[PDB]
Symmetry: D2
Subunit: 260 residues, 4 copies
């Protein structure tokens, strides 16, 4: 009996196969990166609007500057003279909880609230009573009538092309309530990608509800952020090498030493 | 005085900027993933055929099955119950030398030969005399009589869209000479991506020769393989989680213990 | 205001300090690797038997061969021509759940049962009724009649030097109950290190119960396995380099390809 | 035919074996961590003074504060809410070149100079003429008449127990020359460990010269720094968790954004 099982790619034949589709057919059908992701991650031939949406998610998450945890760690690692893979990985390892984990957390929280049948106002008043933050809501500067253009771009695409967007509709009702009190409590990019990704899996027609719930549960949205942000982290590595930036050492004046 | 310097992304303003292009303009111009890569890695607005070529490279390198070093390690790590990032990274760390390093090695070797002015026959004779293998040449089963379809797809796109392909032309002449002696010494997918990527940087019009050479030197092609193959490794992680595969332990019958 | 806070090491003075102890005093007091770990991980000057016990844990977890997940991944990564750090890390990243996570899981499970006041027989019954495995119990070949020598070495040391071993005593009572039914349900090395490490934190006198519980909760035992097994993984890296082992590729005959139609 | 080969540890039998020594014998012989390292890394039963030296190396490299590249990255990773292994590894991945690479670089540079037969004065003038720094030399504050105490501890142990220290002797002659012009150009702890480790391998009696050279070449000294510093990095992870330190984001005022024009 075989010790390994695999479902995504077969390289043994005359031609490379991605989830049952020969590579020449992947190109003939113009599936793109989005469609290759649909085959390798989900073993589905996704509709073209789903492929393009996935590509849009990767584009909007590609980078968010050098100050965030992962980009900062990659930069330090490049400045210490390390190779591309080590530097990228040093940054990627910061991802999953407080940094880059909100896509997954927003998808789960909004799905749970929606599936439980609680209306948006009561979801908001419950989270306010329990003292818990709504994942995927809030921005430091952007506000209801000063939108995050990444959210706008995704939202226009999703609402036009998806057969339905019930979770996004629910999240937007939450946003109307939260922004009535504090204008900066908008549906942020992590919240938008999270809910729209659930809407894609649940309504594109390629998944049963059980499969959609499983892919969220095992971390498909963490995968999206990781693959997307890897573009920016490789870019930071290349940039630090070209800028001939030397070894970094954090300044002592920014560290409080509280030893016994 | 600032301790860090950065050139690729500015998130401080009203709108996210990738190398001077606001994110809304990235989408208006239909830049795609390849165009976002051009901005973040090279700080250039690349021509559309260059953007599509980059996307084709990522698609053909997305996965090559579960047996290769990195996929194997990712699978083991997923089967040990680890998270997506740890599992991906365990596989990525196998990349750069014997596994996934040939795109970079072929680009460098072919560029060095071409830039030195030596003709293809002279290059083959130089390597045969020095006992050194030509990187990007050779296949275990494909040959001049039985072509690799990923090579055919990439080669046809490049020859139909690029304004010039001198390094590819040079490598195809080397292939004619090597395959005349040993038919399995074809220009392989790593060799093709490597030389075609140099052709894109050198001839698309966005780079000086010094810039093109610098990007190859600091590891742009390692970046392409890593970003591309990350798609397949995330896919393997998700697959092992869905297949509910348990802890792996290598069989003792496949290990020779030669202790003192 | 400072953006970072740190408690373990001060390198700003002319002499390096580990948790309030100058490096010359660390050597003068013969604190060793175990005592340096006590300072850097716990900010305590631990008793000498605790320092030695920590060193014994690192020695028994140093390696368990090339077949386990992490050593295997390290070997593959070395055979792919990668550097020492990449190869080590590729293997370390397999640690924490099904591989190398049982020290932490056993410490937590036994501590929870002990702290709840349930007696060993009632803990075994509670787990059998809930269909949950007892972490740190069970071995493929070792038994009540064929002991695990790492367990024996650790247990012999602990009973000779620890002022009290209430959690190990509790775990050994659980072992008597499980081995009476099935001979192979022994207290294994992960179970032993896990409960003995809790006993050290709780009874050496350097920690309050709240501090001992916190160090277990934030992953001190994961740290022990990781630091210990890093010795073996670096050894595997060096070994593969000396053996001039070439690129590995898993055989197709050992893989079942179950792609869609 | 077997696809793998291994020399360091056999777990198949009744008792775990480290390079031919059963685990009960490892403890009965009081081998310690240094002796376990000698078995697993080198497949040798090293003399006790060599085992002790290895342990002293791990103790002196255990940590050097939170500001250095690797500790800083581990701290960031812990503050982002990640697990111990991810946080440790994020820091370890910074090691090998500009950070933590000087033990290996000093061992190789001093060995090459010594093996080539060039005298210490001529090695110093060559490096000045070529504009290359001597690896394992230099200290921000200690100097020839104000020694570094980690160097003093290790150097005394080495000279007191090793049967011969020709590379250390050569490095000390280099130090006398460098410090005659710039007092802080002392043999630092990376230089001391690097040359003393070569002296151990070459003179303890357990290795042939070919084996000693091979272990330096394949990265034994990188291994020492990595294993040693892992202790401090795990310590930083635990510390950040106890201090309940929140998500870090680097301040914009410390970053110069020089993007291409809009």
């Amino acid at each position: 009996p075989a010790s390994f099982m695999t479902s995504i790619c077969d390289e043994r034949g005359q031609e490379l196969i991605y989830a049952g589709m020969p590579i020449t057919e992947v190109f003939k059908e113009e599936m793109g990166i989005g469609g290759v992701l649909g085959l390798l991650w989900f073993q589905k031939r996704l509709p073209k609007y789903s492929c393009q949406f996935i590509e849009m998610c990767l584009m909007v998450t590609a980078d968010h500057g050098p100050a965030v945890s992962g980009a900062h760690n990659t930069i330090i690692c490049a400045r210490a003279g390390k190779d591309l893979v080590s530097s990228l990985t040093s940054g990627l390892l910061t991802i999953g909880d407080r940094f880059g984990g909100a896509l997954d957390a927003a998808a789960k929280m909004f799905s749970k609230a929606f599936d439980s049948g609680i209306i948006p106002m009561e979801f908001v008043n419950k989270m306010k009573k329990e003292g818990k933050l709504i994942m995927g809501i809030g921005h430091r500067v952007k506000s209801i009538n000063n939108p995050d253009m990444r959210v706008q771009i995704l939202k226009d695409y999703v609402r036009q092309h998806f057969p339905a967007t019930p979770l996004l509709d629910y999240a937007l009702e939450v946003e109307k309530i939260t922004t009535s009190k504090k204008p900066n409590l908008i549906l942020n990019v992590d919240g938008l990608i999270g809910v729209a990704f659930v809407d894609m899996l649940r309504n594109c027609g390629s998944f049963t509800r059980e499969e959609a719930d499983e892919y969220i549960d095992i971390g498909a949205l963490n995968g999206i952020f990781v693959l997307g942000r890897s573009m920016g982290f490789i870019g930071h590595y290349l940039d630090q090498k070209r800028l001939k930036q030397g070894l970094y050492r954090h300044p002592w004046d920014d560290i409080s030493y509280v030893l016994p």
